[PDB]
Amino acid sequence: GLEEFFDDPKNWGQEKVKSGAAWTCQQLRNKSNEDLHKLWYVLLKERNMLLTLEQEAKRQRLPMPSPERLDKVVDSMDALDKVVQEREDALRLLQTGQERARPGAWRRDIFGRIIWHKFKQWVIPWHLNKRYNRKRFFALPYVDHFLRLEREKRARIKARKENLERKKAKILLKKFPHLAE
Amino acid sequence: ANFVSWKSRTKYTITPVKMRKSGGRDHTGRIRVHGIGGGHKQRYRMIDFLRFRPEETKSGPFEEKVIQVRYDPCRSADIALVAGGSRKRWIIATENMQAGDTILNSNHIGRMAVAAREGDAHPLGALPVGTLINNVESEPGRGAQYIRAAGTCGVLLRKVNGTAIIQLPSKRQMQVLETCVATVGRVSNVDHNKRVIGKAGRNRWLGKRPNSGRWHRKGGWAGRKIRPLPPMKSYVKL
C-alpha cells in the first residue's frame, strides 16, 4: 500500500537510521536472474521511500536522516544493472557475435564529421521513407575548408596544453631543485 | 519561390473550380505582367471548346439541348450549359442562344452546303460561303482557339482544294482545312464593348491595378501607322 512509500513509523524523526552495505557486483553475480529480478523491486521500493523522505526534508527545511542510504541504494541498483547487462552482452556475443544490441553504422554527416548513426525502427523500407531520405549522409566539397580549419583549431589547443605542461614542469624544478633525478 | 499553378484538375466537370490569382507574378515570384492584382474572387467553369466531342460509346452527329445561358466571370462572352445523352458541358453561347434550344454538332461534309442555323457546329466545308462563324480551330480536332470573345464573328470567304479561307476579327485571312469545325453565328454579348466602367473603383473589382505615375516621353513607335493587311496565315501544309 501507500505506507511502503514511508519508512517504518518508529523511525520517523530519528536523527540517524543505520543501514547495511550496498550490494556489490561480485555478490550479485552469484544470484540467479529471477533473484536479481525480485531484488530489483526490493531495491526499487526502498529507493522510492528514500526519495520521498528526501523531498519531505526539503519541504520541512530539515536535514535528511542518514542521506547515505540513498547513495547505497543507487549504487546497489547500478551494480544490478551492470550484472544483468554483462550476462546479456555475453549471450549476444556467443549467439550472434555482435558487440552492440542496437544496430548502427559509421556515417559522414552534412557537416563532414564522422558519426555513429544509431538505427531506428521503421515499418517501410528506407528507399520509400520520405523523411529519412531528406537527411544528407554525405558532405560536399565546400565543407573541406571548414574541416581543415577545425583540425587546425584542435592542433592549436593541443599545442598550448602541451607547452604549458612543460612550463609547469620547469616551474616545479625551480621551487624544488632536488628533482633532477 | 513555391508557386504552384492552380490549373491542376485533370478531369472535366461543370462544377465551378476554385482558381488562384497571380498578381502578375510568374513562378519565380517576380512581377512578369504589370497592372494585375486583387479583384473579386472567381470560380472557373471549364468550357469545352471541342464542340464535336461524341460521347464515349457514341459516334457521328449528335444534338444537345441548351439548359441555361449565364454570366461567366472569366470571359467576356456568356456561356451555355448544354446537355445531350448523359453528358453535360459548358460551351460558349451565341448571340441568340436561349434555354430550351436544340443545337446540332455534326462532322459531315456533303456535296451541298447545309442551311446554317446559329449555334450549330459544322465543318467549314459544309457551310455556305459568307456564313458568319465563331469558335474556329486552326487544325482539325485541335479545339476552338479563335473568335471566342464577346460579339466577335468571322466570315467564310472561300473554299478551295479541300481548304477554307476565313476572315479573322482583325480582318487578317486564315487558311484552314475544310474539316476544321466551326460554330455558326456571333458570340454572345454583342454590346460588351459599349460598357462604361464609370469609376476607377470598378476597374479594381476587375483585378486591374492603376498605371504607373512615371511620365514616359513618346518615341518613334507612337503616331498613326498605315500598314498593309498582313499576308494570309496558312495552317495547311502542301
Add this chain to the structure above:
Amino acid sequence: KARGNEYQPSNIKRKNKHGWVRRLSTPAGVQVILRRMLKGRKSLSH
C-alpha cells in the same frame, strides 16, 4: 511615426526564417552553421 518597434515576434516566422531546417536547405545556409560551429557558438541557429 515612432520607430524602434520593428520586431513583431512570431514563433512560426522565426523558425521558418532562421530555423535549423531552413539553414540546412541550401549550401550557403550550411556554411553559416559551419562558421558558427567553428567560432564555437552556443546557439547554432534559432
Add this chain to the structure above:
Amino acid sequence: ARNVVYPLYRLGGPQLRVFRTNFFIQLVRPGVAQPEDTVQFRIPMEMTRVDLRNYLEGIYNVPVAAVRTRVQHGSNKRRDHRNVRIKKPDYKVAYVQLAHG
C-alpha cells in the same frame, strides 16, 4: 522505461512487457487543500498516467480510480556569478484518486 528504445508494435504482435522498470516516483505533500482520496506524486517526465496506474497497482497493490497529470515549469530566472541563467528542472506532477472509498 526511460532512455531506452521501445520495440515497435505491429497489429497482431506480442504484448510489450517491462521486467525491471527504471521509473522512480516520490509521494509529495500537496501544497494546497486536496480531496481526501487524492494522492500527489512527482513522476518522471516520460511516465504516462496509464503507466502510473499500472505502476502503482502492480508494484504497490494500490487500487487507483483516476489519474491526472500536469507538467510544471521550473524557473530559469536565477543567475550564477557569471550572469548565466540557472535552470531549475521541470518535473511532472500526478494526482491519483483512490478507488474504493
Add this chain to the structure above:
Amino acid sequence: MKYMVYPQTFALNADRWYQYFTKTVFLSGLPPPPAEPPALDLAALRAVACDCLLQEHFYLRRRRRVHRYEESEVISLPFLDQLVSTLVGLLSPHNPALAAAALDYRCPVHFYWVRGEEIIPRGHRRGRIDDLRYQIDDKPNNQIRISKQLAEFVPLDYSVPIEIPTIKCKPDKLPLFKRQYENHIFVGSKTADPCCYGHTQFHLLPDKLRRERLLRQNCADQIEVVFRANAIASLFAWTGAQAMYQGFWSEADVTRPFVSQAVITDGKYFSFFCYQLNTLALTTQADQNNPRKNICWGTQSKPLYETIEDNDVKGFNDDVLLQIVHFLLNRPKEEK
C-alpha cells in the same frame, strides 16, 4: 469567468459536489405519493417497448458496420428517441396533457447561477471578493415541456434532517475548470414559447461513461454516482431555468416549488429521479438565513432487459416500464 458544470461527468463522487453547488439534498426512492380522491393496457405497452428495442438491435438492417464505439449513437440514441415518441402517443388517452405537450429532441438547456464567494489569491485583483459563478450546458436526448406546471411533491417549507455535503477544498479539484462565455438561461425554448414548464427529461449516458468501462477502471462504486450527478445537475438547471422564466431570482425567491422528472439510462439500465426546486437564493448574501433546501429523489438503476438474442428480448422487466409510464401519466392538478 465561471465554472463549467457538466451533468454527465467523469469526475469521481461528483454527485456530492453537485449537491453543494445546487444546495440539493438527495433522498433514496421516489417522492411520497399524494393521497387524493380508462384502463391501462400493460400488454400493449410492453409490446411497443419490445418492438422498439428489437427494431434498433435486430430488424432494422444497417448498411454500414456498427462498431462498439458507435453503438451508443447508432443504436441506443434512436431507441430512446422512438420509445419516448410512441409511449406519449399511446398514453394520450390516459393523460390529456401529453396530447398538447411539446416533445423536443436534443435541445440545449442552460442555467447560470452564483453560489458562494472566494478571495482572489493572486494577481492585481488579489484579496478582493469574487463570486463563484457556475454554468450548466445540458443537452437532454429528449424532453417534454407543458404549458401548465406540475404539482409540488412536498411543501415549499419541507424540512429534512439531512445536511447538504460540504467541500473542504476548491471546486477546481473535482476537477472543474473555468471559462468565460455567454451566460445562458434556457429551458429548451425562448421565453415567447407558451410551453415554459418542464414535464420529463430523458437522458442517455455517453459511451465514455459506459458501465463496462467504469468496472475496468476500478470505478464500480461510481456507477450510481454517474446517474445521480447527471440527475441533480440536469434537473436543477431545468427547474432553475423554469423559475427564472417566471421572474424569480436570488433576490426574489420562488413563491412556489418547481418540480420536474428525469429518466436516466445507458440504453439498458434505467434510473428514475424527481427534483423539486424550492429556492434560488443561493448567493452568500441571499443564502445567509435561508432554511430552504432543494430536494432530489432517485432510484437505483435497474435493467430493462437481460439480453437480446436474435429477435427475442430475454428477461424483459415490466417494473422498469411501469415506472416510465407513471411519470408520463403525471399531469397538472385541474383548478376549479
Add this chain to the structure above:
Amino acid sequence: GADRMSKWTSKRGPRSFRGRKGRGAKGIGFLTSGWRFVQIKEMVPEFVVPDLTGFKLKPYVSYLAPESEETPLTAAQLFSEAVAPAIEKDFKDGTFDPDNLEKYGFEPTQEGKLFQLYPRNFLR
C-alpha cells in the same frame, strides 16, 4: 528579441506548436477520424512484477561480509560454465558432430524467438 539559449519545449509557440510537441512519453496508440484516440493494449508497457513473499534478500547487505575479487563475466567464462561440460561429455561418449550444436544451445538465427538478442526487441 527571442530567447535563443533556453530549451525549446511544448510550452512555447502558438496553439498548433504547443500540441504537436511532447515531453518524450512513448505513444500507446493512434488518432482516428474525429481526433478520436485509439489506445492499443499491446503498446502499453506491462510491468512484470514478481511475488516477493518469502524473499530473503534485502535492500542492504551486512557489513560482516567477506570481501571478494571482482571478476566480470565474459563470453568465454559463460561458454565454459554452460556449454563446455555437455560438449566434453558427448566427446567422451563418442557421439559429437556439428549438426547437433543446436542441442548444446547454439541458436543459428535470432528470428522466430520472442526475445531476440540482435537487433534487441525487448525492454530492460
Add this chain to the structure above:
Amino acid sequence: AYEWGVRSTRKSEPPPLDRVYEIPGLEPITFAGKMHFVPWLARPIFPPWDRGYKDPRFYRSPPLHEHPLYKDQACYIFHRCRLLEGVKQALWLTKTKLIEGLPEKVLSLVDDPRNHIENQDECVLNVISHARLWQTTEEIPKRETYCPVIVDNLIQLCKSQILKHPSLARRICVQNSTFSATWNRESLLLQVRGSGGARLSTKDPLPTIASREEIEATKNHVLETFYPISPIIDLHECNIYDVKNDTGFQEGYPYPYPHTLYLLDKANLRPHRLQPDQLRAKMILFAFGSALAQARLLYGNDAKVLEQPVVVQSVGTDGRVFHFLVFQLNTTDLDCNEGVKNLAWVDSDQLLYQHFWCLPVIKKRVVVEPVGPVGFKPETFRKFLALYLHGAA
C-alpha cells in the same frame, strides 16, 4: 483538343537512368549497400515492396475490375441524385402516369370538421413560430435546424388525434431506414437506393386508390419522351453492384408496410437544395422504390400486372414549401413502354407560409411588420393531415 492538367502540376518523370545499366555484363555500383543516397554513386533499382500483412489504416483496395461484384453491364443508381428534367424523367423511369391533385378519397378525410384538430390554426402557427424563432438560443435558426423540427412537430400534432381514431396507434415513425429496388426500363438496369428522411410504418397496407377500370385505362397513355437527353442523365453509372431488392427490415418486423415517406431538403445553401421539380422527382422514385420492394417481397420477382396494387405516400418539404405525393404501383412489367402504367397523384408547391420575420421590421422608429409567420395557409396543413389520417380515419 485541350487537355486538362498542366504539366508543371503533374508528377515529374523519373530522371534518366544511369548509363552503366545499358552496358551488358556490367554490375553497377550503387548506394543501396550504404542505405542512403550519395551524388557520386548510381541510383539502385529497387524491387517493388509488399507489406505482407493486413494494416487497416494503410489498406489499398484491389483494382476495380478485379472486385467480385464487377459487372460489364452498368447499373444506373438513383438521395443525392438531381434529375435534369425533374418529374418528366421520373415519370418515364417508373412507367407511371401523373394526375394533378390529391385523390378525392384522401382529401375527403379532412372535409369532415370532426377530423379537424382542436385549435388547428393556432396550433400550426405555434409550430411555425417554434421552429423558426423559439427553437434555439440563436436569433435566426438555420434551415438545417428548423426544417427537420417543423416536420417532426407537425407529425406530432397529427399524432394527437389517436383519441378520435384508435387505429393511429398501429403506426410508428422509423429513422435511418433504407431500401433498394432494381428493375429494367428499355433494357436499362435501374436501381433506387433510398436513405434519409422518416419512414412512417404501418401494420396494415394502405387501401388501393384507383379502381381496376382506371388502371386499365392507363394503357392508352403514352409516356412523354424528351430527346436528346437520355432518361438516365444525372444517375450514378455503376459497374460494381449487386442486384439487391431490400425493404430495409428483416422478416418479422411488426410494422412492415411503408405508409408515408417524409423527405427533407434542409441544406442551408440554396445551390445545395433541390429545385422543386427535382424534389418531386425524388419523391416519385423513392415512393416507387418502396412500393416495388414491397411488391417483390410479397408477390415474388416475376414481372406482372399486380392484382393488389401497392400504395405508398410521400411528403417532401424544405421547411416552408410542401409537396404531396400518392403513388400506386399497378405493375411490375416495367421493361416495356406499353401496357398498364403506375399512377401518381402529385400536389405541388403548397406554401405553408409565405415568409417569417424573426425580428421586427422598423422603418423610421415605426414597426412596419411584426414578428411571426406571414401569409399562413391552413389548407396546406389540411392536405398534410389528410395524408396522415389516410388508412386510419
Add this chain to the structure above:
RNA sequence: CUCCGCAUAAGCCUGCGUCAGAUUAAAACGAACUGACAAUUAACAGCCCAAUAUCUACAAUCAACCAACAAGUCAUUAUUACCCUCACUGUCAACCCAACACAGGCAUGCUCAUAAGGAAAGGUUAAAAAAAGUAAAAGGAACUCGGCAAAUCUUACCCCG
C-alpha cells in the same frame, strides 16, 4: 477618477503566492530583488481521417417579395478494408513590441458605463518669467505676411485640379 474593464488570440516564460533575508521602488519599513518552498489537474484548446473510381449548373444579404453584378466560404455515391477506445501537449503572473515599472504600438468577443478597474496633490509658500484654462468696461480686425489663435456658426466670388 473611469481613458476603461473581463476574456481569447499572439507574445512572454515564473516575473508583488508562502517563509526568511533589510537586498531595494528614479522617495519610502511594500517588494516586482535575493535564497528556500509551493504551483497550472480536461470536459476548453491543440494533436485527426484506409484505398480506387465517381459525384458536386442554380450565391450571400431575416431569403420571402424586388432588383442586381464585382458572379460568390460550406454537398457525394459505388465496392473493398475496418472491433478499439479516452493517450500526449497548452492551462501561473501585476505579462507583450518600444534600451526603462516609457503619456507611444497592439487583433477579436463581451460590457456602453460599469457589479470591473483606478488616484491628478511628498510638505509648505502663493515673487518674476513660462505653460494650461476661465472672466472682462467701451470699441470690434484698428492685430498680423495672413482673422494665426480664440470666439462665433457665416455672404459672394476667383485661380488650379
Add this chain to the structure above:
RNA sequence: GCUACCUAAGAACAGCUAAAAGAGCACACCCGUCUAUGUAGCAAAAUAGUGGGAAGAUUUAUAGGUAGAGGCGACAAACCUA
C-alpha cells in the same frame, strides 16, 4: 516579423438622412490639415485641441512570395528593420 506590392484563407464597420450610391452627417477604427506644447522630450517624431475619411480604390489579424548590377513603386528618385 518594419515598409512597398502581391498570394491564400479570415475579421471589423453604431446611430441618422437618403435609400440608388468609390452619397452626406457622425462613433469605433484609419489617416495626420492647422496651432500650441515638447526639443537628452512621455516619444531617436510624442501630447492637447482642431481636422480629412469612415460600405470602400476602406481598415485590419494570420501564413506565404518578390533581394541589392536587385526588388517593389496610383514616380515622392517613394519604400526595402530608426
Add this chain to the structure above:
RNA sequence: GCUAAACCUAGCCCCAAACCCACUCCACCUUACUACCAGACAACCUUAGCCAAACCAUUUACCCAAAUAAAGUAUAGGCGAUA
C-alpha cells in the same frame, strides 16, 4: 582620514618535434536535439576590385613543392609603371 594604491600568478606568444581524427544509455535534417509509414530534389562551371601607373582605358608581384647560385640576367611591357 577617506576614496584608493601596491602585488604574480592564471594563462598566452614564437619555434622545435610529431601527421591527424571518435565512442556510456536516450534525442537530434519535420518547427534539429521530435520513438513508429508510399517516396524518388540532388555535387562541380575563368574571381573581382581596391590599389600602382601620381587621371585612366592595355597593364599592376601573391607558396605550389631543394636552401644557395646562375639573376634581378634572358625575356615581357600604354617597351610606361612594373613583371
